[PDB]
Ligand SMILES: [Zn+2]
């Protein structure tokens with residue numbers, strides 16, 4: 678059923694399906710070979726790996 682990512686008090690990071698071509702970690706400005714996760718609550722669509730650099734939850 679629906680991915681209840683909302684369960685977390687912290688960043689949801691909802692993954693965006695790569696449209697048959699690249700996507701961009703808006704955070705990095707660099708292309709996301711892997712499915713970028715987007716915390717729709719406040720931040721950006723970042724590399725899965727880049728999520729590590731986020732030590733502060735939803736604004
Ligand atoms: Zn990144």
Ligand SMILES: [Zn+2]
Nearest residue numbers: 688716718735
């Ligand atoms: Zn957030």
